[PDB]
Design a protein around this motif. Structure first.
Motif, PDB file in Angstrom:
ATOM      1  N   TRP A 135       0.853  -1.190   0.000  1.00 15.45           N
ATOM      2  CA  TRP A 135       0.000   0.000   0.000  1.00 15.45           C
ATOM      3  C   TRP A 135       0.896   1.250   0.000  1.00 15.45           C
ATOM      4  O   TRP A 135       2.035   1.164   0.466  1.00 15.45           O
ATOM      5  CB  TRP A 135      -0.954   0.022   1.206  1.00 15.45           C
ATOM      6  CG  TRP A 135      -0.243   0.024   2.526  1.00 15.45           C
ATOM      7  CD1 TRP A 135       0.130   1.111   3.262  1.00 15.45           C
ATOM      8  CD2 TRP A 135       0.224  -1.127   3.236  1.00 15.45           C
ATOM      9  NE1 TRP A 135       0.801   0.707   4.392  1.00 15.45           N
ATOM     10  CE2 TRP A 135       0.867  -0.665   4.405  1.00 15.45           C
ATOM     11  CE3 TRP A 135       0.160  -2.512   2.998  1.00 15.45           C
ATOM     12  CZ2 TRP A 135       1.413  -1.540   5.352  1.00 15.45           C
ATOM     13  CZ3 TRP A 135       0.739  -3.373   3.911  1.00 15.45           C
ATOM     14  CH2 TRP A 135       1.345  -2.889   5.080  1.00 15.45           C
ATOM     15  N   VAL A 149      -4.528   6.170   0.734  1.00 14.20           N
ATOM     16  CA  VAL A 149      -4.698   5.911   2.160  1.00 14.20           C
ATOM     17  C   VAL A 149      -5.274   7.228   2.703  1.00 14.20           C
ATOM     18  O   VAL A 149      -4.616   8.282   2.632  1.00 14.20           O
ATOM     19  CB  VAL A 149      -3.397   5.443   2.880  1.00 14.20           C
ATOM     20  CG1 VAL A 149      -3.621   5.264   4.381  1.00 14.20           C
ATOM     21  CG2 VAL A 149      -2.875   4.145   2.272  1.00 14.20           C
ATOM     22  N   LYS A 151      -7.062   7.337   5.847  1.00 15.57           N
ATOM     23  CA  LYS A 151      -6.983   7.382   7.311  1.00 15.57           C
ATOM     24  C   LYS A 151      -6.275   6.165   7.861  1.00 15.57           C
ATOM     25  O   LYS A 151      -6.450   5.068   7.335  1.00 15.57           O
ATOM     26  CB  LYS A 151      -8.398   7.497   7.929  1.00 15.57           C
ATOM     27  CG  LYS A 151      -8.429   7.924   9.399  1.00 15.57           C
ATOM     28  CD  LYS A 151      -9.844   8.228   9.864  1.00 15.57           C
ATOM     29  CE  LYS A 151      -9.919   8.388  11.361  1.00 15.57           C
ATOM     30  NZ  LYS A 151     -11.309   8.642  11.820  1.00 15.57           N
ATOM     31  N   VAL A 152      -5.483   6.361   8.925  1.00 18.14           N
ATOM     32  CA  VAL A 152      -4.794   5.295   9.645  1.00 18.14           C
ATOM     33  C   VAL A 152      -5.325   5.326  11.079  1.00 18.14           C
ATOM     34  O   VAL A 152      -5.236   6.360  11.734  1.00 18.14           O
ATOM     35  CB  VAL A 152      -3.240   5.372   9.584  1.00 18.14           C
ATOM     36  CG1 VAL A 152      -2.615   4.111  10.178  1.00 18.14           C
ATOM     37  CG2 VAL A 152      -2.737   5.583   8.153  1.00 18.14           C
ATOM     38  N   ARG A 159      -3.802  -2.132  12.947  1.00 19.69           N
ATOM     39  CA  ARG A 159      -3.758  -0.822  12.317  1.00 19.69           C
ATOM     40  C   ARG A 159      -4.790  -0.896  11.203  1.00 19.69           C
ATOM     41  O   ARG A 159      -4.653  -1.712  10.286  1.00 19.69           O
ATOM     42  CB  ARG A 159      -2.373  -0.497  11.716  1.00 19.69           C
ATOM     43  CG  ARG A 159      -1.258  -0.398  12.734  1.00 19.69           C
ATOM     44  CD  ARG A 159      -0.334  -1.590  12.637  1.00 19.69           C
ATOM     45  NE  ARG A 159       0.743  -1.501  13.626  1.00 19.69           N
ATOM     46  CZ  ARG A 159       1.967  -1.055  13.367  1.00 19.69           C
ATOM     47  NH1 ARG A 159       2.294  -0.661  12.142  1.00 19.69           N
ATOM     48  NH2 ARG A 159       2.879  -1.009  14.328  1.00 19.69           N
ATOM     49  N   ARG A 161      -6.575   0.796   8.015  1.00 25.07           N
ATOM     50  CA  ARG A 161      -6.446   1.822   6.994  1.00 25.07           C
ATOM     51  C   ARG A 161      -7.727   1.898   6.207  1.00 25.07           C
ATOM     52  O   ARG A 161      -8.268   0.868   5.803  1.00 25.07           O
ATOM     53  CB  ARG A 161      -5.261   1.549   6.062  1.00 25.07           C
ATOM     54  CG  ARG A 161      -3.950   2.014   6.636  1.00 25.07           C
ATOM     55  CD  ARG A 161      -2.768   1.457   5.870  1.00 25.07           C
ATOM     56  NE  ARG A 161      -1.527   2.130   6.275  1.00 25.07           N
ATOM     57  CZ  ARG A 161      -0.810   1.812   7.346  1.00 25.07           C
ATOM     58  NH1 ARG A 161      -1.195   0.821   8.144  1.00 25.07           N
ATOM     59  NH2 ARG A 161       0.293   2.482   7.633  1.00 25.07           N
ATOM     60  N   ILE A 163      -9.002   3.081   2.877  1.00 26.60           N
ATOM     61  CA  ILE A 163      -8.415   3.313   1.555  1.00 26.60           C
ATOM     62  C   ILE A 163      -9.480   3.630   0.509  1.00 26.60           C
ATOM     63  O   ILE A 163     -10.574   3.063   0.532  1.00 26.60           O
ATOM     64  CB  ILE A 163      -7.524   2.070   1.176  1.00 26.60           C
ATOM     65  CG1 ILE A 163      -6.266   1.990   2.082  1.00 26.60           C
ATOM     66  CG2 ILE A 163      -7.135   2.020  -0.314  1.00 26.60           C
ATOM     67  CD1 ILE A 163      -5.493   0.649   2.072  1.00 26.60           C
ATOM     68  N   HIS A 176      -8.505  -1.914   5.312  1.00 28.03           N
ATOM     69  CA  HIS A 176      -7.312  -2.754   5.415  1.00 28.03           C
ATOM     70  C   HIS A 176      -6.978  -2.948   6.886  1.00 28.03           C
ATOM     71  O   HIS A 176      -6.641  -1.988   7.570  1.00 28.03           O
ATOM     72  CB  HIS A 176      -6.139  -2.096   4.637  1.00 28.03           C
ATOM     73  CG  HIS A 176      -4.863  -2.886   4.632  1.00 28.03           C
ATOM     74  ND1 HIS A 176      -3.921  -2.739   5.636  1.00 28.03           N
ATOM     75  CD2 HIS A 176      -4.389  -3.764   3.716  1.00 28.03           C
ATOM     76  CE1 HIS A 176      -2.925  -3.556   5.324  1.00 28.03           C
ATOM     77  NE2 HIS A 176      -3.157  -4.190   4.175  1.00 28.03           N
TER      78      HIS A 176
END
Ligand SMILES: O=P(O)(O)C(F)(F)c1cccc(-c2cccc(C3CCCCC3)c2O)c1
Length: 284
Positions: A135, A149, A151-152, A159, A161, A163, A176
């Motif tokens: 990614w 991406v 937001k994390v 974690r 993500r 996407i 993700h």
């Protein structure tokens, strides 16, 4: 029963609790299950070596994910080491089990995400084990699809993500989940983070609404940790619906779809630890 004779052991609460703690019976049961591995000579495709992390872990031909764009007739362009996996009650294509992408298969993996309309990816890899980071940090384009991406989200065990996937006028969302709490020793105290991941992913899958597209699950070879995650996910639904768990029958179902699903006896016992814990949680 198409590729081998399926086996079954229906467990009610007490037997499940006791079975999770009987490694001698667990190994006796486990090592009777056929691996259903593919003979590597089943594939005779020039350039295939670069597509496989392991030469003996190949996708079973009947359930293999074929990459139909840009050339379904080209055996190499069409290839990815991935299989469609049936879910609870034999529902078709609930999951796709695949190996962790390698440098030469990063773009092939995104072709698969796009083709399948995958709304969710489950990655079971430790921070120290870094699967190629497939990614982008922010944005990247592969074969006309812009991957962003957006937001994390950092939680204790994963974690997440959020996407965005864009090609022309169509935009799609993707979640993700990078799980980092896969244990070295599959002891019962290491079961809660995996159970939490299973539950979080099945709730996100339900939010996609009717006929959810395949959920991609991967680890290094796409059979061990991937087999555990999928088997646990199926058995959680079986437990809620039927009041029992059949890990043995579920493992056979997985092996018919992809050879080697649940790679080790310690992983097989871990699934029993996760299911025994979930049964206790549900009992309240
Ligand atoms: O819980 P985990 O860390 O995943 C584990 F299961 F303990 C574990 C520990 C060590 C190695 C592997 C493993 C992972 C991918 C592929 C293979 C191949 C199997 C066929 C022959 C070549 C190696 C592995 O052996 C799995």
């Amino acid at each position: 029963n198409l590729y081998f004779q399926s086996m079954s052991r229906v467990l009610q609460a007490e037997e499940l609790h006791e079975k999770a703690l009987d490694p001698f019976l667990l190994q006796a049961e486990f090592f009777e299950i056929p691996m259903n591995f593919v003979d590597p000579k089943e594939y005779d495709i020039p350039g295939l070596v670069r597509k496989n992390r392991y030469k003996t872990i190949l996708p079973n031909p009947h359930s293999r994910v074929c990459l139909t764009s840009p050339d379904p007739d080209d055996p190499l362009s069409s290839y990815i080491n991935a299989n469609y996996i049936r879910g609870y009650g034999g529902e078709e294509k609930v999951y796709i089990a695949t190996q962790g992408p390698i440098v030469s298969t990063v773009a092939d993996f995104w072709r698969m995400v796009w083709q399948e309309h995958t709304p969710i990816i489950v990655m079971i890899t430790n921070i120290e084990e870094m699967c190629t980071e497939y990614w982008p940090e922010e944005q990247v384009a592969y074969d006309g699809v812009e991957i962003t991406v957006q937001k994390v989200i950092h939680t204790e065990d994963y974690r997440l993500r959020l996407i965005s996937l864009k090609s022309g006028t169509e935009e799609r969302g993707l979640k993700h989940y990078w799980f980092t709490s896969w244990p070295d020793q599959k002891t019962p105290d290491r079961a809660p983070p995996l159970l939490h991941l299973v539950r979080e992913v099945e709730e996100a899958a339900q939010q996609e609404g009717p006929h959810c597209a395949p959920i991609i699950v991967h680890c290094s070879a796409g059979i061990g940790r991937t087999g555990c995650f999928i088997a646990t996910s199926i058995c959680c639904q079986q437990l809620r619906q039927e009041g029992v768990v059949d890990i043995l029958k579920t493992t056979c179902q997985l092996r018919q779809d992809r050879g080697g699903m649940i790679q080790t006896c310690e992983q097989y016992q871990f699934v029993h630890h996760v299911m025994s814990l979930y049964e206790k949680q549900l009992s309240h």
